[PDB]
């Protein structure tokens, strides 16, 4: 039989990354050429990431560790305009390196919640020497880490345990959600993605809205929507890794002002799970299959999906 899988969630929640993991886990991975094609994206991601930090410093009133970085900071924008796909020159690499080691820049990086910084910034920036090589071919992790904004609706086909999986990947931004109705008919399961780490961040499309609340309001909308009654609502509480790192530094009370609990992984994660699971109104009738995932980790996604599939197999 055929399965209509629908990947939903607010922007930057991890939908498209899960879609890549289906390719990795169920279709012999990415070829070398396929990886080479992401070289340009990895450079773009890296370059924009450092630029984001620099831009923020002025707004947030943060100064460079060494006054000599001002040169490099301006030199970043000069060479960002020239040094184009698909080569990072040694000069640019050195500029980005110096800026990234600088204490003022690091200060600003640490306050990234006050602006919009790619999740993968430090992943790439801390790995600059490797990626900056002219002979550099991105790894699968590099590919999985890349950020490319999904716009519209994209359909994928794969097979697993004798099931024809029709998978639908959509854009998560407010502007995109009108379009979601185009793939609501005949849905077997929805995998709703929540970026755990978004609890202290604000929406790129509205900087007065806390991301986690946007995700909550959205899930409430979907979860209780009467046309997904005969439809498996799987919840991926995603980015557990970034979350595990965040919760030691940034208090969850930014998101939930009433939360009297500790800032440790399992207690916080448990609290967030409740906030979503409590929004379910057909609690007597409808079951929510929640999982804590790391979309960029193949072993994790493979385990969780294997589980997800078994749910569907039993529930159909």
């Amino acid at each position: 039989k055929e399965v209509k899988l629908l990947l939903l969630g607010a922007g930057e929640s991890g939908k498209s990354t899960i879609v890549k993991q289906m390719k990795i886990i169920h279709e012999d991975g990415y070829s070398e050429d396929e990886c080479k094609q992401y070289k340009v994206v990895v450079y773009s991601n890296t370059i924009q990431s450092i630029i984001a930090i620099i831009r923020a410093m002025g707004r947030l009133k943060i100064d460079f560790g060494e006054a000599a970085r001002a040169d490099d900071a301006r030199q970043l924008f000069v060479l960002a305009g020239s040094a184009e796909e698909g080569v990072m020159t040694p000069e640019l690499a050195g500029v980005i390196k110096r800026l990234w080691r600088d204490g003022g820049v690091q200060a600003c990086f640490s306050r990234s919640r006050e602006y919009q910084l790619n999740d993968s910034a430090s992943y790439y920036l801390n790995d600059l020497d490797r990626i900056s090589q002219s002979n550099y071919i991105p790894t699968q992790q590099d590919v999985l880490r890349t950020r490319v904004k999904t716009t519209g609706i994209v359909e994928t086909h794969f097979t697993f345990k004798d099931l024809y999986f029709k998978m639908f990947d959509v854009g998560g931004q407010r502007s995109e959600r009108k379009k979601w109705i185009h793939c609501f008919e005949g849905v077997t399961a929805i995998i709703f993605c929540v970026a755990l780490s978004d609890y202290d961040l604000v929406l790129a499309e509205d900087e007065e809205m806390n991301r986690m609340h946007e995700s909550m309001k959205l899930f409430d909308s979907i979860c209780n929507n009467k046309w997904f009654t005969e439809t498996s609502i799987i919840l991926f509480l995603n980015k557990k890794d970034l979350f595990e790192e965040k919760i030691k530094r940034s208090p969850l009370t930014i998101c939930y002002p009433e939360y009297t609990g500790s800032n440790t992984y399992e207690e916080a994660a448990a609290y967030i799970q409740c906030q979503f699971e409590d929004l379910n109104r057909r609690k007597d009738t409808k079951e929510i299959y929640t999982h804590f995932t790391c979309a960029t980790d193949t072993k994790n996604v493979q385990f969780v999906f294997d589980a997800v599939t078994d749910v569907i197999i039993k529930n159909n």
Binding site: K149, G171, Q173, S175, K178, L203, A204, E205, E207
Partner: peptide, 11 residues
């Protein structure tokens, strides 16, 4: 909520 609302950020 425009009919052909494009996907840009708020800034």
């Amino acid at each position: 909520e425009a009919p052909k609302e494009i996907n840009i950020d708020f800034q």
